Amino acid sequence: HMKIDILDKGFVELVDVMGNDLSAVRAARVSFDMGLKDEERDRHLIEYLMKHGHETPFEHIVFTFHVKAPIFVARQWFRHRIASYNELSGRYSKLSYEFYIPSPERLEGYKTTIPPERVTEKISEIVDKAYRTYLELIESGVPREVARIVLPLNLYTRFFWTVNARSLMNFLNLRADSHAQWEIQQYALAIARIFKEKCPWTFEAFLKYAYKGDILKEVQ
Amino acid sequence: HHHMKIDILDKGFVELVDVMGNDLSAVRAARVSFDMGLKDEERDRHLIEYLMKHGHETPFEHIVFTFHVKAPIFVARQWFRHRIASYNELSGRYSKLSYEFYIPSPERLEGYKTTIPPERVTEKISEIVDKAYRTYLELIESGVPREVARIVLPLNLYTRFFWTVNARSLMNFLNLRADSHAQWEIQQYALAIARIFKEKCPWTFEAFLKYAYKGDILKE
Amino acid sequence: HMKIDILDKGFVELVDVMGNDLSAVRAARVDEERDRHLIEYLMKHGHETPFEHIVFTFHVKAPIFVARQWFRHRIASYNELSGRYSKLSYEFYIPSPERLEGYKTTIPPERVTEKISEIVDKAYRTYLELIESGVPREVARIVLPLNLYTRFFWTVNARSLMNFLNLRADSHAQWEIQQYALAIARIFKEKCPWTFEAFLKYAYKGDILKEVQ
Amino acid sequence: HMKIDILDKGFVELVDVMGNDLSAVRAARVSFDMGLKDEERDRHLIEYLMKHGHETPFEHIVFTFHVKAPIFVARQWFRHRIASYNELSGRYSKLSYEFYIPSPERLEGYKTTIPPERVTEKISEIVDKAYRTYLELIESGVPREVARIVLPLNLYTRFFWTVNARSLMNFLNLRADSHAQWEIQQYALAIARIFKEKCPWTFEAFLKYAYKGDILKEVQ
Ligand SMILES: Cc1cc2c(cc1C)N(C[C@H](O)[C@H](O)[C@H](O)COP(=O)(O)OP(=O)(O)OC[C@H]1O[C@@H](n3cnc4c(N)ncnc43)[C@H](O)[C@@H]1O)c1[nH]c(=O)[nH]c(=O)c1N2
Ligand SMILES: Cc1cc2c(cc1C)N(C[C@H](O)[C@H](O)[C@H](O)COP(=O)(O)OP(=O)(O)OC[C@H]1O[C@@H](n3cnc4c(N)ncnc43)[C@H](O)[C@@H]1O)c1[nH]c(=O)[nH]c(=O)c1N2
Ligand SMILES: Cc1cc2c(cc1C)N(C[C@H](O)[C@H](O)[C@H](O)COP(=O)(O)OP(=O)(O)OC[C@H]1O[C@@H](n3cnc4c(N)ncnc43)[C@H](O)[C@@H]1O)c1[nH]c(=O)[nH]c(=O)c1N2
Ligand SMILES: Cc1cc2c(cc1C)N(C[C@H](O)[C@H](O)[C@H](O)COP(=O)(O)OP(=O)(O)OC[C@H]1O[C@@H](n3cnc4c(N)ncnc43)[C@H](O)[C@@H]1O)c1[nH]c(=O)[nH]c(=O)c1N2
Ligand SMILES: O=c1ccn([C@H]2C[C@H](O)[C@@H](COP(=O)(O)O)O2)c(=O)[nH]1
Ligand SMILES: O=c1ccn([C@H]2C[C@H](O)[C@@H](COP(=O)(O)O)O2)c(=O)[nH]1
Ligand SMILES: O=c1ccn([C@H]2C[C@H](O)[C@@H](COP(=O)(O)O)O2)c(=O)[nH]1
Ligand SMILES: O=c1ccn([C@H]2C[C@H](O)[C@@H](COP(=O)(O)O)O2)c(=O)[nH]1
Numbered sequence A, D: 001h002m003k004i005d006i007l008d009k010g011f012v013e014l015v016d017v018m019g020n021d022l023s024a025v026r027a028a029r030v031s032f033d034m035g036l037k038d039e040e041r042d043r044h045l046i047e048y049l050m051k052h053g054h055e056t057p058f059e060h061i062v063f064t065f066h067v068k069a070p071i072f073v074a075r076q077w078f079r080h081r082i083a084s085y086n087e088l089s090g091r092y093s094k095l096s097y098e099f100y101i102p103s104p105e106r107l108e109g110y111k112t113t114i115p116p117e118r119v120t121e122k123i124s125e126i127v128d129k130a131y132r133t134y135l136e137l138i139e140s141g142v143p144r145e146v147a148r149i150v151l152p153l154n155l156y157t158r159f160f161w162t163v164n165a166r167s168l169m170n171f172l173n174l175r176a177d178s179h180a181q182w183e184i185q186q187y188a189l190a191i192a193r194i195f196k197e198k199c200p201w202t203f204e205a206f207l208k209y210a211y212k213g214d215i216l217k218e219v220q
Numbered sequence B: 001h002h003h004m005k006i007d008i009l010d011k012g013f014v015e016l017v018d019v020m021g022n023d024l025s026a027v028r029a030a031r032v033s034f035d036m037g038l039k040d041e042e043r044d045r046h047l048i049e050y051l052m053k054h055g056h057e058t059p060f061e062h063i064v065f066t067f068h069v070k071a072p073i074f075v076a077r078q079w080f081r082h083r084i085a086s087y088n089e090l091s092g093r094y095s096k097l098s099y100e101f102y103i104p105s106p107e108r109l110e111g112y113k114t115t116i117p118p119e120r121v122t123e124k125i126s127e128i129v130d131k132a133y134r135t136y137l138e139l140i141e142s143g144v145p146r147e148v149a150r151i152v153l154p155l156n157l158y159t160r161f162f163w164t165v166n167a168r169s170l171m172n173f174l175n176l177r178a179d180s181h182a183q184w185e186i187q188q189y190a191l192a193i194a195r196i197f198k199e200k201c202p203w204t205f206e207a208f209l210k211y212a213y214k215g216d217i218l219k220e
Numbered sequence C: 001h002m003k004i005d006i007l008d009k010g011f012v013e014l015v016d017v018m019g020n021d022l023s024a025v026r027a028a029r030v031d032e033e034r035d036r037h038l039i040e041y042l043m044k045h046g047h048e049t050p051f052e053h054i055v056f057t058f059h060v061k062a063p064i065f066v067a068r069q070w071f072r073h074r075i076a077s078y079n080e081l082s083g084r085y086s087k088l089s090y091e092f093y094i095p096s097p098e099r100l101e102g103y104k105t106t107i108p109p110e111r112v113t114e115k116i117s118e119i120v121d122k123a124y125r126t127y128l129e130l131i132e133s134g135v136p137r138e139v140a141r142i143v144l145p146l147n148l149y150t151r152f153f154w155t156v157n158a159r160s161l162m163n164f165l166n167l168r169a170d171s172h173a174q175w176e177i178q179q180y181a182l183a184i185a186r187i188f189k190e191k192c193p194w195t196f197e198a199f200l201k202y203a204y205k206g207d208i209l210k211e212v213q
Helices: A021-032 A039-052 A056-060 A071-077 A116-139 A144-150 A165-175 A182-198 A200-210 B023-034 B041-054 B058-062 B073-079 B118-141 B146-152 B167-177 B184-200 B202-212 C021-028 C032-044 C049-053 C064-070 C109-132 C137-143 C158-168 C175-191 C193-202 D021-032 D039-051 D056-060 D071-077 D116-139 D144-150 D165-175 D182-198 D200-210
Strands: A003-006 A010-018 A062-070 A084-087 A156-164 B005-008 B012-020 B064-072 B086-089 B158-166 C003-006 C010-018 C055-063 C077-080 C149-157 D003-006 D010-018 D062-070 D084-087 D156-164
Touching: A003 A182, A010 A182, A010 C010, A021 A039, A021 A056, A021 A200, A021 C077, A021 C149, A039 A200, A056 A156, A056 A165, A056 C077, A056 C149, A062 A071, A062 A165, A062 A182, A071 A156, A071 A182, A071 B073, A084 C049, A116 A144, A116 B118, A116 B146, A144 B118, A156 A165, A156 C049, A165 A182, A165 A200, A182 A200, B005 B184, B012 B184, B012 D010, B023 B041, B023 B058, B023 B202, B023 D084, B023 D156, B041 B202, B058 B158, B058 B167, B058 D084, B058 D156, B064 B073, B064 B167, B064 B184, B073 B158, B073 B184, B086 D021, B086 D056, B118 B146, B158 B167, B158 D021, B158 D056, B167 B184, B167 B202, B184 B202, C003 C175, C010 C175, C021 C032, C021 C049, C021 C193, C032 C193, C049 C149, C049 C158, C055 C064, C055 C158, C055 C175, C064 C149, C064 C175, C064 D071, C109 C137, C109 D116, C109 D144, C137 D116, C149 C158, C158 C175, C158 C193, C175 C193, D003 D182, D010 D182, D021 D039, D021 D056, D021 D200, D039 D200, D056 D156, D056 D165, D062 D071, D062 D165, D062 D182, D071 D156, D071 D182, D116 D144, D156 D165, D165 D182, D165 D200, D182 D200
Parallel strands: none
Antiparallel strands: A003 A010, A010 A062, A062 A156, A084 A156, B005 B012, B012 B064, B064 B158, B086 B158, C003 C010, C010 C055, C055 C149, C077 C149, D003 D010, D010 D062, D062 D156, D084 D156
C-alpha cells in the first residue's frame, strides 16, 4: 500500500496488484510453447518485447489504484476507456469542503497583471462562495444532484482505477508528458513510481525503448 | 443520415451528424451465420425481433451513429462513462469559454418542498455562475493560462462534443440513461437519442422497446 | 493450485487472481452480512462496474474450434501458442463415442471416432513431411484440422467473465466450450463465492449452472 | 461495392462507410470551438494530427467490410478486439468445398527437398480427404458442429468487419508489414486500397507520419 500525496489535498494509493515482470514473460513465452527460464534471459525477453512493440504480454499485469483528484483532472483521466472506474457520486453524497487551490508557484513563468498570490485568493474566494451556495440549497431542500451544479471544476473527487500495464503505459505516454496539463502530469508521476516499484524490469525497458513522453526521462 | 436536431434544456442539443447502416445492416450481419443475406421485409423484420428477444446483440454493432451534443459538464461526466464509444470534446485548456450555463427552471424543483421559492433557487444558481464566469474572464485578462483560470467554473458550464457509437452500445446507453434512476437532465438527452434511433432504425427500436429495453421512461 | 482437466487432453488452470468479493464492495461503496447484501443488491439492479475490479488469469489448453469461439470475447487479454513459430505436437481432440450417442447415425459412434482419428493422423503426417522437407511452419500447419490443441493465457475481469458464463455455460453453446465454462465457473466460485452465488441468483442468463453443482 | 480478390478464392469487399477526411477535421476542431475551414487548412490539420499522435479524431470514420478468408488468416484477424465481427457458422452451415491451396510461388526463397508443385499437391490431397470425411460424417447423421472438426485450417470462412479508421490504422501497422504472415499481408494491402480511396488525406498523412509497417511504402 504505497501512498503518494499530489497537489494540496490529493493522492494516488496502490490498493492491489496482480502479477509482476514474470507475468509478461510467461505470457510472451506461450507463443514458443515455453515458460520461465532464468533472470537474465527473462529480463532480456522483457527488453525484446518493449523494443519490438510486443505489447499484449503486458496486459496480464493489473493494478488497482485509489485516487483523490480535482474534477478537471478526473475528466481528463476518465477519457482513458481501456480501464475500470468507480467514483464518489455528487448525486447521492453530501460533498466535502475540499478543493484544489493552486499555489502561487503554479503561475511561475507567466507574466500576470495581478500577483500569483492574488490569483490564489480569487480562486479560493469563488470556491468559498460556491460551496456556501451549495450548502444553502441543500439546507433549503434542493436535491443534491441539482445543488452541486454550482460547484467549481477544482472540487476534489475520489475514485478506484483498475488498469493493466499496457493501458497504464499508454496513460504514461500521454499524461507523463509536458503537453498534458501540469496537474495531471503530477498524478502520472505518482502512477509511474508505483509502476516502477512493482514492475522494475518492465518500467526500465519501457523508459528505454517505448516511452513516448518527455518528463519521465528528466524527473527521477 | 441528414442533420436531425433536438433542443435539450435551456441551451443544449443533440444533433445527428452521420449514420452508417439501418435495420438491414443487422439482418445481413446475422444471416452470414447461415451463409445467407437479405430475404424479404416480413422475414427480415421477424429476424430483428428474434435477435432482440434472444440476446443475439453483435449484429447491431454494424449500425453506427455520430452525434453532436451540447451539454452541461455534469451531464457530460455521466455520459463519458460509456467507454464503448468515441468522443471529441471542446477543450477548456485551449478555448476561451463562452457565457453558456445550464440554469434550471423553477419547474425542476416540483415535488420538493423548499424553504425558499424555486424562482429564488434559479436566481441563486444564476448569481453564482455570473460571479464564477466574471472571475474566469478576469484571470484570463490578467494573463492566467486558460487551463488554470477555468477551474473556478461551475459544473453547469456548457461543453460540446462529438459522439460516435454503434446501436448495441447506444441500446445499453438507453437502458441506463432513458430511465428514472438516471439524473433528470441526462434522461432528457437520452430521450433525444432514442428519438433519433427510432427514426433511423424503426424495426430495431420497436423490437428493443418490446423485448430488451430495461428502462422505464421510453414506454411512457 | 487449481487445475481442471477438460475433454480428452485439455485443461483450465488458475494462474493468478486480483481481489475477491470485498474488492467489488470497496469499489461500490465510494461486515459480512452487509457486504453480501450489497453484492446481491448490485447484481439484482444491474450495477456491474464494481465487479470489474476482480481480475483472473487462466492457462487454458483447448482445441482450435473452441478457442475460436472463446477469442470472440473481446473484453479480455489473450496470449496464445503460435503455429507460425512452434513445431506443433500430436495433440488433437478426438470425440469419444458418447459425444454422438443421442443422434441416430448410420454408422456406429465408435466408427465415427475412428474416421476422425484417421484423418487427423493423415493430416499430422503430411504436416511433419512438409516441415522435414523445408516448408515453413506457417504454411505447413494449414493442413492441420480444427481439433488441433492450442494453449493460451486468458486475463479477464469478473464482469466480462460473467458475460462469458451467461453465453458459454448454456445449452445453446457448443458442448465442448460448455465443459470449459463449467471449469471457469468452479474456479470463479472458489475465489468469489458471494459474487458467484449472487450472479446465479439474480443475473445469470444461462441454464446449465443452475442444474450442475 | 469495391471488391478486391485475394489469394485463390478470397476477397475484401467494402460494404459501407461513415464519414470521410472531414469527419476527423470536424472532431479535431471542436477542441478550439471551431468547425471546417477550407481544403488547404483542413488537409494541413489532418497532417498535423497524424504527425503529433492525435489519434482520437480518426475514430469518427467507420468502415464495414465483407471478407472471405482462410480460417488461419481469420484467427490472426479476429485478435483485433477494437472492432465488430459476424462470421459464417460451421455449427449451423454445411460448409462448401473452398480451401486455400498455395501456389508453388508461395514457397519461393525457401530451399525445399521436394518441388513446390508437390507441396501444392500434398496440401490439395489432404484437404480432399478431410472434406470427403466431413461430408460422410454429415451424411451419416453426425451433427455439423462435430463433423467440421476434421476440416483443415485453410478452409475458407466469411465475415463482416466493422472498424473505425484508428483501429484500422493499427491493423495496417501490424498486418501490412513483412513480420505478419504473407497471407494476411495480402488482405491488409486490399484494406489499405479501400482506405486510401475513401480517406485520401488520412491515408497519405498516415503513410507519411504514423505508419509503422514496411510494405505500404513500397507497394502502390
Ligand atoms: C495533451 C492532450 C490533449 C488532449 C487530449 C489528450 C492529451 C494527452 N485529449 C484526450 C484524448 O482525445 C483521449 O481521449 C485520451 O488521451 C485517451 O487516449 P486513448 O484513446 O489512447 O486511451 P484509452 O484508454 O481510451 O484507449 C487505449 C488505447 O485503446 C485504443 N482504443 C480504445 N478505444 C478505442 C476506440 N473506440 N477506437 C479505436 N481505438 C480505441 C487506442 O489504441 C488507444 O491508444 C483530448 N480529447 C478531446 O476530446 N479534446 C481535446 O482537446 C483533447 N486534448
Ligand atoms: C443511475 C446511475 C447511477 C450511477 C451510474 C450510472 C447510472 C445509470 N454510474 C455509472 C456506471 O457505473 C457506468 O460507468 C455507466 O453506466 C456506463 O455503463 P457501461 O459500463 O455499461 O458502459 P460502457 O460503454 O463503458 O460499456 C458498455 C458495455 O461494455 C462492457 N464493458 C465495457 N468496458 C468493460 C470493462 N472494462 N470490463 C468489462 N465489461 C466492460 C459491458 O458489457 C458494458 O455493459 C456510477 N458510476 C460511479 O462510478 N459511481 C456511481 O455512483 C454511479 N452511479
Ligand atoms: C450460442 C452462441 C452462438 C453464436 C455466438 C455465441 C454464442 C454464445 N457467436 C459469438 C457472439 O456473436 C459474440 O462474438 C461472443 O459471444 C462474444 O460476446 P460479447 O460480444 O458479449 O463479448 P465481448 O467480450 O466481445 O464483449 C463483452 C461486452 O462488452 C460489450 N462490447 C464489447 N465490444 C463491443 C463493441 N465493439 N460494440 C459494442 N459493445 C461491445 C457488450 O456489452 C458485450 O456484452 C456467434 N458469432 C458469429 O459471428 N456467428 C455466429 O453464428 C455466432 N453464434
Ligand atoms: C507479427 C505478429 C505476430 C504475432 C501477433 C501479431 C502480429 C502482428 N500476435 C497478435 C497480437 O498479440 C495481438 O493480439 C493483435 O496484434 C491485436 O493487436 P492489438 O491489441 O493492437 O489490437 P486490438 O484491435 O485488439 O486493440 C487495438 C488497440 O487497443 C488497445 N487495447 C485493446 N484491448 C486492450 C486491452 N485489453 N488492454 C490494453 N490495451 C488494449 C491497444 O492500444 C491496442 O493497440 C500474437 N498473439 C499471440 O497470442 N501469440 C503470438 O505469437 C503472436 N504473434
Ligand atoms: O447517475 C449517475 C451518477 C454517477 N455517475 C458517474 C459519473 C461520475 O464519474 C461519477 C459521479 O457522478 P455524479 O453522481 O457526481 O453526477 O459517477 C453516472 O455516470 N451517472
Ligand atoms: O489535456 C487534455 C485536454 C482535454 N482532454 C479531454 C478531457 C475532456 O473530456 C475534454 C476537455 O478537457 P479540458 O481541455 O477542458 O481540460 O478533452 C484530456 O483528456 N486532456
Ligand atoms: O457457438 C458459437 C458459434 C459461433 N461462434 C463464432 C466463432 C467463430 O468466429 C464463428 C463461427 O464459429 P463456428 O460456428 O464455426 O464454431 O462464430 C461462437 O463464438 N460460438
Ligand atoms: O502473425 C501472427 C501470429 C499469431 N497470431 C495470433 C493468432 C492466434 O490467436 C495465435 C496463433 O496464431 P498462429 O501463429 O498459429 O497463426 O496468435 C496473430 O494474430 N498473428
